[PDB]
Amino acid sequence: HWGYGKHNGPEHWHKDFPIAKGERQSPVDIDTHTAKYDPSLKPLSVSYDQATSLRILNNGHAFNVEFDDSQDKAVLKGGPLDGTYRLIQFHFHWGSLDGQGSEHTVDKKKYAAELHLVHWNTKYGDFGKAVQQPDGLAVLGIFLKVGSAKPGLQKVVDVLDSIKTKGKSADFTNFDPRGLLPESLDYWTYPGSLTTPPLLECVTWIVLKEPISVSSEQVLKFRKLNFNGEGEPEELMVDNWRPAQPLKNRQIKASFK
Ligand SMILES: [Zn+2]
């Protein structure tokens, strides 16, 4: 089935998921000289004070940190959004080397990794309904560069040994996602898709301009994870990123000058 290899990677996905070649696929290259400032865009409201993490799972493609989304505890609003979007999970994409790993690119620059905080529009009642709608999800994307350690990431890094292989999960309570955010909330926004199958065109992307810094040791621990299940041939979980897709008939808007 689908993955990130020669035989089942991004270049193959369109045979199972023909929407791969659609009009609003993600990620994209952000060309900072053609993104237009939109003074009508509001500041982003990220309200994570009551966020309730539950569990961390190796799904064979990444690891997901999952949240209780059964009430309005952690929500994204404002910016380009109408209405309220509830946090359900976050995950990352990363490289085998520090020079690649991000999904979005900025003027063709690849970062070492990219964090995705996934939120669903409460007017659709649940996640599965929301992904069927063009405004169903809002994904906050944050780039990671290698430099100083990110203290707020360490709790994640130190549980990874317990979820090494596909299908493994661990309790992951009381994790505060505010510690993964950069200082500035300046962003770019555009309409797009999920970046993994089923590649549904349901996402308002909100990509922050300012990266976070993580240390080489932190990223090294991500690269020890496995795509495989326990007692299968080891295949390191690296390069779990989809390359940039054609922008087509879209505009990328900036919240800042
Ligand atoms: Zn993602």
Side-chain angles (χ1 to χ4, degrees):
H1 282 275
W2 73 270
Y4 293 96
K6 288 132 179 147
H7 299 286
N8 70 351
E11 76 282 20
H12 294 272
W13 293 353
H14 69 100
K15 292 173 280 172
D16 290 308
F17 304 99
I19 206 177
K21 299 184 187 278
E23 302 297 316
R24 52 177 274 197
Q25 293 288 295
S26 295
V28 300
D29 188 48
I30 299 165
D31 177 341
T32 65
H33 292 105
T34 63
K36 190 176 183 193
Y37 169 62
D38 189 344
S40 76
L41 282 171
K42 303 156 202 170
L44 273 182
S45 172
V46 188
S47 297
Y48 288 165
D49 52 294
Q50 298 290 295
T52 300
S53 63
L54 290 176
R55 196 173 74 138
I56 192 175
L57 173 68
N58 180 332
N59 68 14
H61 301 121
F63 63 87
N64 290 169
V65 176
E66 303 168 343
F67 288 81
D68 177 1
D69 66 342
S70 68
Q71 293 194 83
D72 286 322
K73 286 179 165 193
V75 306
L76 186 66
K77 301 183 80 166
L81 305 173
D82 300 322
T84 290
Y85 289 71
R86 263 201 208 159
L87 179 65
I88 179 168
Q89 55 103 325
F90 70 78
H91 62 273
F92 302 82
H93 307 262
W94 61 93
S96 57
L97 316 148
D98 301 343
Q100 62 191 209
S102 69
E103 296 210 301
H104 294 88
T105 58
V106 179
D107 305 324
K108 302 291 179 84
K109 178 187 172 62
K110 296 175 167 96
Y111 288 89
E114 187 170 330
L115 165 64
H116 288 162
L117 296 124
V118 180
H119 309 75
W120 57 266
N121 193 332
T122 58
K123 80 187 199 167
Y124 300 120
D126 66 73
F127 179 85
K129 289 287 198 309
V131 294
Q132 301 179 59
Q133 313 306 143
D135 60 350
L137 294 186
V139 183
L140 184 62
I142 300 173
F143 297 117
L144 280 63
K145 67 180 200 190
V146 172
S148 303
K150 192 70 170 182
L153 184 59
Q154 192 66 28
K155 288 206 263 173
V156 172
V157 168
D158 280 328
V159 80
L160 298 178
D161 273 342
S162 78
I163 60 151
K164 187 179 172 179
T165 50
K166 179 173 73 172
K168 292 211 152 285
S169 65
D171 294 317
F172 201 65
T173 55
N174 305 104
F175 181 77
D176 185 342
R178 291 180 290 187
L180 295 176
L181 305 176
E183 179 190 318
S184 177
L185 299 176
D186 292 341
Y187 65 88
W188 300 280
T189 186
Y190 76 97
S193 75
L194 304 179
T195 71
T196 52
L199 300 168
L200 295 172
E201 292 182 339
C202 63
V203 182
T204 303
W205 280 96
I206 301 167
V207 175
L208 295 188
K209 176 181 51 41
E210 184 172 20
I212 62 167
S213 288
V214 302
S215 60
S216 191
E217 295 88 351
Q218 289 180 317
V219 166
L220 287 161
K221 288 192 182 161
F222 285 30
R223 298 180 184 138
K224 292 181 139 163
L225 289 164
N226 283 185
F227 285 127
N228 58 278
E230 192 183 6
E232 299 170 355
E234 186 177 36
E235 186 60 0
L236 291 180
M237 182 177 281
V238 296
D239 294 318
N240 57 353
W241 51 275
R242 188 190 195 192
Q245 300 299 308
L247 191 63
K248 301 197 167 152
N249 185 46
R250 295 175 291 178
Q251 289 195 323
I252 304 182
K253 297 173 188 180
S255 74
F256 59 90
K257 299 209 86 135

